[PDB]
Amino acid sequence: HHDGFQTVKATIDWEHPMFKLYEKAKRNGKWNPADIDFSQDQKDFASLTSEEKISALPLVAGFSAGEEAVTLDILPMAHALARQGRLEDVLFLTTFMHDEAKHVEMFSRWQQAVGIGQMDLSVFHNDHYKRIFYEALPEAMNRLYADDSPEAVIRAATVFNMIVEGTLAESGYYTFRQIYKKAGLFPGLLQGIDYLNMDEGRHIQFGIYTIQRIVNEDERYYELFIRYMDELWPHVIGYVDYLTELGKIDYDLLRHYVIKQFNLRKKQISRT
């Protein structure tokens, strides 16, 4: 049951950080994947040899599944914060979820346009990828339906925002630009990546805000955050190692970028 409503008893908290992020999301998140011209991407893909075609698919497989997972798996966080009365967080999260919908749409439109929509790309998800995206991510989010404790919320935001988005996805954009911008390939996909990267800046800000406001209640939660980050590292690097070996471009450059992002995300939360 609803006890009452914040915008009847009072108003939105106009100064709340998540209301301010919501306002930014509306002003900056206007792109439509349906407007991207993928016609040259189709011709670029056809120009590749069979071996070069295969080389591009593991990264796309990781992104399509990843965007689909985050579209579905943010819903428990929205529910948990709604149940806690965090209205401004909920408003922001409507933009987060609509951003992810666009991300899923974008990669799927690319697959369709280049002629691989009919190909099952699941073959490029190894055990480490599945441990994160098929298992750990939905487990941590769904937990929030029955357990919205600080510990549960930190774990959810750690897996979702700091690892999935802040480590793997961030490193994926970089990788795609290092390879394909340089090769002059897939301009429509790279335009989509640029819009997506802008959206995801907001998503990471929500994760940092959420983790830090809980850590501020108790430094014991800081140690939980670091432990959950380290818990998932073997799977992050296990997936990275798998893509790197498929790749055979400076792969050690890309690998160190992943490590850089992982340590960066840790440093964006303060014990204090």
Fill in the DSSP letter of residue 145: T
Residue 173 CB, nearest approach to Mn ion (Å): 10
- Closest by CA position to 38, among listed 138, 105, 123: 105
Can you tell me the distance from the alpha carbon of 170 to that of 150, in angstroms, rounded to the nearest whole number?
26
Q: Which residues of 9-30 are buried (b: 16+ CB within 10 A; e: fewer)?
A: eeeeeeebebbebbeebeeebe
- Is 102 a residue that touches Mn ion (CB under 5 A)? no
- Is 11 a residue that touches its own copies (CB under 8 A)? yes
Place of tokens 């055990």: 127
What 3-state class would DSSP assign to 49? coil
Place of tokens 């206007």: 30
- The size of the interface with Fe ion (CB under 5 A), counted in residues, is 4
Site string for ligand PLM, 2-41 (x = CB under 6 A): ----------------------------------------
Residue 79 CB, nearest approach to its own copies (Å): 5
The two tokens of residue 246 are 């498929």
- Is 165 a residue that touches Fe ion (CB under 5 A)? yes
- Is 67 a residue that touches Fe ion (CB under 5 A)? no
CB nearer to Mn ion: pick between 64 and 222: 64
Site string for ligand PLM, 159-188 (x = CB under 6 A): -----xx--xx-xx--x-------------
| Contact residues: Fe ion, CB under 5 A | 165, 200, 203, 238
